[PDB]
Design an enzyme around this catalytic site. Sequence first.
Site, PDB file in Angstrom:
ATOM      1  N   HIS A 179       0.845  -1.187   0.000  1.00  0.00           N
ATOM      2  CA  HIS A 179       0.000   0.000   0.000  1.00  0.00           C
ATOM      3  C   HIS A 179       0.882   1.239   0.000  1.00  0.00           C
ATOM      4  O   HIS A 179       2.030   1.200   0.447  1.00  0.00           O
ATOM      5  CB  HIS A 179      -0.904   0.048   1.240  1.00  0.00           C
ATOM      6  CG  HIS A 179      -1.956  -1.017   1.280  1.00  0.00           C
ATOM      7  ND1 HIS A 179      -3.102  -0.960   0.517  1.00  0.00           N
ATOM      8  CD2 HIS A 179      -2.050  -2.150   2.018  1.00  0.00           C
ATOM      9  CE1 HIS A 179      -3.850  -2.020   0.772  1.00  0.00           C
ATOM     10  NE2 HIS A 179      -3.233  -2.759   1.676  1.00  0.00           N
TER      11      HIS A 179
ATOM     12  N   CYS B  55      -0.031   2.935  -4.422  1.00  0.00           N
ATOM     13  CA  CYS B  55      -0.759   4.158  -4.734  1.00  0.00           C
ATOM     14  C   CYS B  55       0.084   5.384  -4.424  1.00  0.00           C
ATOM     15  O   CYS B  55       0.980   5.352  -3.577  1.00  0.00           O
ATOM     16  CB  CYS B  55      -2.060   4.238  -3.942  1.00  0.00           C
ATOM     17  SG  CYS B  55      -3.347   3.140  -4.535  1.00  0.00           S
TER      18      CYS B  55
END
Lengths: 5, 5, 91, 91, 140, 140
Positions: F88, F130
Site C-alpha cells: 500500500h 498508490c
Amino acid sequence: XDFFX
Amino acid sequence: XDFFX
Amino acid sequence: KIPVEADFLFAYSTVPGYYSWRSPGRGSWFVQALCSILEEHGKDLEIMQILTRVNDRVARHFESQSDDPHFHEKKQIPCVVSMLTKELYFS
Amino acid sequence: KIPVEADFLFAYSTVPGYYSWRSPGRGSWFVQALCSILEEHGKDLEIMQILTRVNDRVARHFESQSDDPHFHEKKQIPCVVSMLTKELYFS
Amino acid sequence: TYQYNMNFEKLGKCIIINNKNFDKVTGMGVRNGTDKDAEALFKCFRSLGFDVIVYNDCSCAKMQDLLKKASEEDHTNAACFACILLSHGEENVIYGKDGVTPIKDLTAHFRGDRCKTLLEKPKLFFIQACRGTELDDGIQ
Amino acid sequence: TYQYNMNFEKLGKCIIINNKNFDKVTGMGVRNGTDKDAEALFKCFRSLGFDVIVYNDCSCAKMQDLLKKASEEDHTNAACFACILLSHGEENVIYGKDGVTPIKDLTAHFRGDRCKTLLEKPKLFFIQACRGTELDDGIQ
C-alpha cells in the site's frame, strides 16, 4: 474484482 | 559566478 | 566529481496523486505488464524501451471492474523517473 | 479508452528538492546541454536517448563556480519523467 | 508499431516562456543568462521543425491563459506539442512575474480529456527552474 | 561509450519487498494477488541474472534496515542494484506492515556519497503502490 493499493 | 533558479 | 543523485531510476506503477490498480486473481496491472515485457524482451531492449512498452500495455490493456460505479472502468498510466546517465541493457 | 495522463514527458533540469544552476554568460546548464545534444543528434536519436545524454553532460561537465564557498564546486543531475507509450523520433 | 506516428503535416507547436524579470514583491531577481537560453532553444527547436513561439516576462495569469488557449487550438495535423519553461521555481511550482503557479495546473490543460486533438500524441514539457533548496555536493 | 558497463561477475542484487498482510492498527486490508506478483517478479529478475531475495510483510524498520545493509555490502563485482516495493502507499511514502515510511529514505542509502561501490552504476527502484486518491477516468 479490482482493488487499489 | 553561477546562480540558481 | 559526480552528483550524489545521479544514476537512479524509479519505475512507478502510477502517476503522482493517483491510484494503482491490482487484480486479486492475476496481480497488479503494472507488474503483470512488466513481467510480460521482461519475458519477451528483457535481454534485447534498453531499459527505457522496456518501460515504455510497459506504459503502453498498462494504458491500453487494463480497465478496472468494480461494483461501485465511482470505480467502474477506470484507467492507469505508470510513471518512469530517470536520472540515468547511460543506456542500460541486461546483457 | 486511454488514460487522460498518458503521453506526457517532463524533462526537468533538476531532481525534486534541489537547486538548478544557471550561468549568466552561457545560460543555464540544462538548456545548454540540451541544445548542444539536440544540434548533433536531435534528428537521429530517440527522445530518451537524447535526454539520457543530457543527463550525462550536466552531471559530468558542470560544477558550480562561486565565491561564497557554501556554493563552491556544487553539482546537478536532471530528471526525466516519462508517461510516453511509444518511442519518439523527431522524423 | 512501437514509435509515435510522425506522418503529419507539421511537427507541431513549440511554446517557450522566457521569464527574466519579476515584480519586486516576489523577492525574485533578474535571471541573467536566460535570453541566451531562449535564443538557443528557439533556434534548436526551429531546426527540428516546430513552429516556435517565444513569450517573455509572463504573469501567472498569462501563463495559464496562453497554455489554456494553446490546448484549445486544433492540433489534428500536428504530430506532437512542446512547451519550455524558463523561470524561478520551487517544488511543484513555477514563477510568473507576479507570483507562483503549480506546474500541474499548467500541463493539465493538455490532458487527454481536455485537449482531444493531442490525444495519443506526445506532449513535452522542458522545465528550467529550481525544485527546492538542496545542494548536490558530488563525489569524485 | 553510451551504455552502462556490464562486464562484471554479477548482474547485481535484487531485493523484493512483498507486503501482503498489515497490522490492525494501520487499517490496511490484505493485498490479494501480491504473491502472484512477487513470484512472477522473482522469475523475471532471476532470469535477467539478478541475485533475488524476497522479504515478506516487512515492518518499516526492517525495510529501512534491509536497504541500509544492502547499501553497505560490497558491489565492486556487481553491475547494478534493483529493489522492488509491493505494498500500500501514498504520495512519497510506502507502507510497512506497521505504518508508513518515506520512499526517499529507502533510496537515499544508495546515493553516490553513501555507497561508493555502486557509484556510476544504475540503481533501480520499481514501486507498485498508490500515490494518492485521484482516479483516471480515461477517454476514448
